[PDB]
């Protein structure tokens, strides 16, 4: 009966270009939200986002190859390299077959979609790049990485919008636990800070508009919430079978204990007031881990800072925790990080891991005035030390009412 453990991490976030730097920033309650400058935001109702600062891949990706890939792919490859390195794993002809990847994204190569389309409109199909398809499609991070590292085991790419990160990690673990693979690099990558991404979610009325204070915009559960904030980044974890990792003396961050999925069956871009769907997703992860809601010390909420969304998740926590409801710590890193969409669940799974290694829980900043009727401990303003925390749970929910929860156990 195969157990899965995390033996490698990598990340690119609006608050740091490494795992450690990003963790540091979050515990210090820093914000990565800034004003956009790569395109004219005049007509845009939202003019800020959590961007990746001074990105550099020169040492990892030839500017020759960079031409064949959208920022989202570029990000994910870098985070994947970080993870592969940090794992210390060495690919051998024996190995190849039993190592793979499960990496996706919510929207994929918007930027190159826009470029290629603009080109076509201005000068015809003659102007489309031969790399249009391969540079924009969601599965390309798994593509480039399996090639770069000679990985030959199972490779998949789940695109469940804002739920992607959690699904890729969850299925990567299943692939391993099932016997199909021994190691899996998994997570997600996103870079939707484009005219289309901003204008698009902007058109749905899903974005915050607090342009006077981009850092105060993302405020989960606070009463002045006005919609989620966009974030770019990538998060990746090397998942590996317990005995395979030991046999190689791998540093093991944590164990992946439970994975749960659910479907809202309600509305395409909104959850029930009731949070029924998030509840089942958490409820199935517990049952998969074989433990009780009482044992969860920390929950990394999906908490996107949308009026209807944050309320639903809260509702669902009460429902699952009941008694403990107030004794469990809950927080949204999105208060500082922004919403990474297809990468949200990857980075947050990383934070849910480090919170067990460091027995510390990052805050929900901007939580000035909670929502009324809230019994929950949303860890507002300042990180919080914890005692004997053995399990953390991570939530991701997405459009189409698709939900997922991962449960991590210490050591």
Ligand X SMILES: C[C@]12C[C@@]34C=CC(=O)[C@@](C)(CCC(=O)Nc5c(O)ccc(C(=O)O)c5O)[C@@H]3[C@H](C[C@@H]1C4)O2
Residues 266 to 305 in contact with ligand X, rule: CB under 6 A: 269-271, 304
**Does 143 participate in binding a second copy (rule CB under 8 A)?**
yes
Residues 188, 158: Cα–Cα separation, whole Å: 9
Among a second copy, ligand X, none, what does residue 149 contact (CB within 5–8 Å per kind)? a second copy
Residues 304 to 323 in contact with ligand X, rule: CB under 6 A: 304, 306-309
Give the residue at shortest CB distance from ligand X.
309
**Selected binder of a second copy within 266, 308, 326, 371 (CB under 8 A):** 266
**Selected binder of a second copy within 6, 61, 81, 113 (CB under 8 A):** 113
The SS3 assignment for 395 reads: strand
**Does 206 participate in binding ligand X (rule CB under 6 A)?**
yes
Q: Given the complex with ligand X, which of 197 and 271 has the nearer CB atom?
A: 271
Place of tokens 């849910």: 352
Stretch that binds ligand X, among 23-31, 112-120, 203-211, 278-286 (CB under 6 A): 203-211
* Sign, Cα dihedral of 399, 403, 404, 405: positive
Do the strands 33-35 and 48-50 form a parallel or antiparallel pair, or are they unpaired? antiparallel
Residues 274, 315: Cα–Cα separation, whole Å: 6
Residues 155 to 214 in contact with a second copy, rule: CB under 8 A: 155-161, 167, 171, 174-175, 178, 180, 195-196, 198-205
**Does 100 participate in binding ligand X (rule CB under 6 A)?**
no
Tell me if 389 sits within 8 A of 356, measured CB to CB: yes
**Does 238 participate in binding a second copy (rule CB under 8 A)?**
no
Residues 240 to 269 in contact with ligand X, rule: CB under 6 A: 269
Tell me if 299 sits within 8 A of 328, measured CB to CB: yes
CB of 47 to a second copy, least distance (A): 11
**Does 202 participate in binding ligand X (rule CB under 6 A)?**
no
Using alpha carbons, list the distances in angstroms from residue 70 to 115, 186, 205. Answer: 10, 19, 26
317 phi, psi to nearest 5 deg: -65, -50
Residues 294, 241: Cα–Cα separation, whole Å: 27
Class of residue 67 by CB neighbours under 10 A (exposed 0-12, middle 13-18, buried 19+): exposed
Q: Given the complex with ligand X, which of 119 and 269 has the nearer CB atom?
A: 269
Binding site for ligand X (CB under 6 A): 162, 204-206, 227-228, 269-271, 304, 306-309, 339, 397-399
């Amino acid at each position: 009966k195969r157990r899965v453990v995390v033996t490698g991490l990598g990340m690119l976030s609006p608050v740091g270009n490494t795992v450690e730097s990003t963790w540091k920033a979050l515990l210090a309650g820093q914000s990565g939200i800034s004003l956009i400058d790569h395109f004219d935001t005049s007509a845009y109702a939202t003019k800020f986002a959590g961007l990746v600062k001074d990105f550099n891949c020169e040492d990892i990706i030839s500017r020759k190859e960079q031409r064949k890939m959208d920022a989202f792919i570029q990000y994910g490859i870098v985070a994947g390299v970080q993870a592969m390195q940090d794992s210390g794993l060495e690919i051998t002809e024996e190995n190849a077959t039993r190592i793979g990847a499960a990496i996706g994204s919510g929207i994929g190569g918007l930027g190159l979609i826009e470029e290629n389309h603009t080109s076509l409109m201005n000068g015809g199909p003659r102007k489309i790049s031969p790399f249009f398809v391969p540079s924009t499609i969601v599965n390309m991070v798994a593509g480039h990485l399996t090639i770069m590292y000679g990985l030959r085991g199972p490779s998949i790419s789940i695109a469940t919008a804002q739920t992607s990160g959690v699904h890729n990690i969850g299925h990567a673990a299943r692939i391993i636990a099932y016997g199909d693979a021994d190691v899996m690099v998994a997570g997600g990558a996103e870079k939707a800070s484009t005219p289309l991404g901003v204008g698009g979610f902007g058109a749905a009325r899903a974005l915050s508009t607090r342009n006077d204070n981009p850092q105060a915009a993302s405020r989960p559960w606070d009463k002045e919430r006005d919609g989620f904030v966009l974030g770019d980044g990538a998060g990746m974890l090397v998942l590996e079978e317990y005995e395979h990792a030991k046999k190689r003396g791998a540093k093991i961050y944590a164990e992946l204990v439970g994975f749960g999925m659910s479907s809202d069956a309600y509305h395409m871009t909104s959850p029930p007031e009731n949070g029924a769907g998030a509840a089942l997703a958490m409820a199935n992860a517990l049952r998969d881990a074989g433990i009780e809601a009482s044992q969860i010390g920390y929950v990394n909420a999906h908490g996107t800072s949308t009026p209807a969304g944050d309320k639903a998740e809260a509702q669902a926590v009460k429902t699952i925790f009941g008694e403990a409801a107030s004794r469990v710590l809950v927080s949204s890193t999105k208060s500082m990080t922004g919403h990474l969409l297809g990468a949200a669940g990857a980075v947050e799974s990383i934070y849910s891991i480090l919170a067990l290694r460091d027995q510390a829980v990052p805050p929900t900043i901007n939580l000035d005035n909670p929502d009324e009727g809230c019994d929950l401990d949303f860890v507002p303003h300042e990180a919080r030390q914890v005692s004997g925390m053995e399990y953390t749970l991570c939530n991701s929910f997405g459009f189409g009412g698709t939900n997922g929860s991962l449960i991590f156990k210490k050591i």
